[PDB]
Amino acid sequence: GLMQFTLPVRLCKEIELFHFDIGPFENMWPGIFVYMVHRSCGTSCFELEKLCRFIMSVKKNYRRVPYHNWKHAVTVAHCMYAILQNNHTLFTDLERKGLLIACLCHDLDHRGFSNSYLQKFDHPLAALYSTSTMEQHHFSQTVSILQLEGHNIFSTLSSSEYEQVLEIIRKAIIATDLALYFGNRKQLEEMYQTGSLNLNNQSHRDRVIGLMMTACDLCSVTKLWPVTKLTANDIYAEFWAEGDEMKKLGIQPIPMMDRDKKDEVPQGQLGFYNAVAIPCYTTLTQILPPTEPLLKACRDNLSQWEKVIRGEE
Ligand SMILES: Cn1ncc(C(=O)N2CCOCC2)c1C(=O)Nc1ccn2cc(-c3ccccc3)nc2c1
Ligand SMILES: [Mg+2]
Ligand SMILES: [Zn+2]
């Protein structure tokens, strides 16, 4: 009960900032996550024994892939922590509980391959889940872990509160399908500009939570340039392995996944920042003004990729 988690001073301070990097010490990440749950949600919202056992089962169900791994899960949870702590009063008690867990679980059992590769390979998961294939899998894996003996961190919630939190988690995890992001952001942009945006409207909150999930998921673009650049290497390690596997199916991969077109990465980053990242953090800042540091960091990194092309690095 009176057992707090305490980080060393540099982490205690920097964990509050959007651009925090959780570091290379894997064994500190569970404690970093519990710290964030305790400060974001309260020391009472989960039984520590049940939370610790849930965290370690989630960790075990992430694979040893270059990018879609346990570090990504905790990284995405930290960005959500930073958003929630900078928007104290905008979110319900159940939303705070559900969203940190959603972020931890959002890529559970990722194989390092896109929905598109699963469909072209004809993976069983593509037959079970026709759209948002991996994201429906990630939610299914989250529910499976919640149902292990002594893993139900939501046990002390009412039947109503329990169905609500699992509903928040399902929507949040599905929203991490970037194919769904484009239409979600357009609708939010329309609603904000016509002044029809209403945070008491559940379907409006759902859309705002969805954009938060995209923002947290893409948060490598909001880090210090060396973190952004080094994270990009892990992203391309997976893209290019998928491209290799496309070539094995006798399919020319898109340039993004073709290690032969390594040369064009800088321009591909510009397209990504302009088409996906900048619009995401722009709309998020309009709806939630205190998330502006994410947009500022993203713009700083866009400027770094522009310097790479101009041969200044
Ligand atoms: C930084 N960041 N963060 C998350 C993601 C991301 O999208 N994820 C979804 C898939 O799962 C990984 C995260 C990225 C990213 O680099 N995106 C992209 C997106 C589109 N591109 C086109 C090219 C490219 C084109 C031509 C030649 C060479 C490269 N390169 C890119 C990188
Ligand atoms: Mg994902
Ligand atoms: Zn992810």
DSSP of 144-188, one letter per residue?
HHHTSTT--TTTTS-HHHHHHHHHHHHHHHHHT-HHHHHHHHHHH
Residue 123 annotated in ligand binding? no
Residue 88 annotated in ligand binding? no
| Shortest-distance Cα residue to atom 6 of ligand 1 | 218
Taking the C-alpha atoms of residue 190 and residue 66, their distance in angstroms, rounded to an integer, is 37
- Among 105, 87, 70, smallest CA distance to 213 is for 105
Cβ of 255 below 6 Å from ligand 1: yes
- Between CA 259 and CA 23, with CA 257 as vertex, the angle to 5 degrees is 90
Closest atom of ligand 1 to 236 CA is: 16
How far the first Cα of the chain sits from its last, in Å, is 51
Taking the C-alpha atoms of residue 143 and residue 88, their distance in angstroms, rounded to an integer, is 28
How far does CA 51 lie from the centroid of its chain?
A: 20
Tell me if 51 sits within 8 A of 153, measured CB to CB.
Answer: yes
- Between CA 41 and CA 47, with CA 42 as vertex, the angle to 5 degrees is 105
Taking the C-alpha atoms of residue 28 and residue 7, their distance in angstroms, rounded to an integer, is 9
Cβ of 266 below 6 Å from ligand 1: no
CA of 68 to the centre of ligand 2 (A): 7
Task: Assess if CATH 1.10.1300.10 describes domain 28-310.
Answer: yes
Tokens standing for 245? 């596997």
Closest atom of ligand 1 to 238 CA is: 12
Percent helix, strand, coil in the chain, to 5, is: 70, 0, 30
The residue behind tokens 């039984």 is 47
Tell me if 276 sits within 8 A of 235, measured CB to CB.
Answer: no
* Count of CB atoms situated within 10 Å of the CB of 230: 13
Taking the C-alpha atoms of residue 263 and residue 261, their distance in angstroms, rounded to an integer, is 5
Residue 74 parent element (H or E): helix 70-85
* Count of CB atoms situated within 10 Å of the CB of 252: 10
Q: Check residue 194 and report its DSSP letter.
A: H
Determine the length of the chain.
Answer: 313
Q: At what angle do helices 29-40 and 70-85 cross, to 10 degrees?
A: 20
Tokens standing for 138? 């990630």
Q: Give me the resolution in angstroms, 1 decimal.
A: 2.0
- Among 80, 91, 81, smallest CA distance to 5 is for 81
Domain boundaries, the chain: 28-310
Residues with a known catalytic role = 68
Q: Which residues, in sequence order, are CB contacts of 230 under 8 Å at separation 6+? A: none
Beta strands in the chain (DSSP E): none
Tell me if 135 sits within 8 A of 173, measured CB to CB.
Answer: yes
Tell me if 43 sits within 8 A of 51, measured CB to CB.
Answer: no
Looking at the CA of 230, which ligand is closest? Answer: 1
Tell me if 219 sits within 8 A of 235, measured CB to CB.
Answer: no
Method for structure elucidation:
X-ray
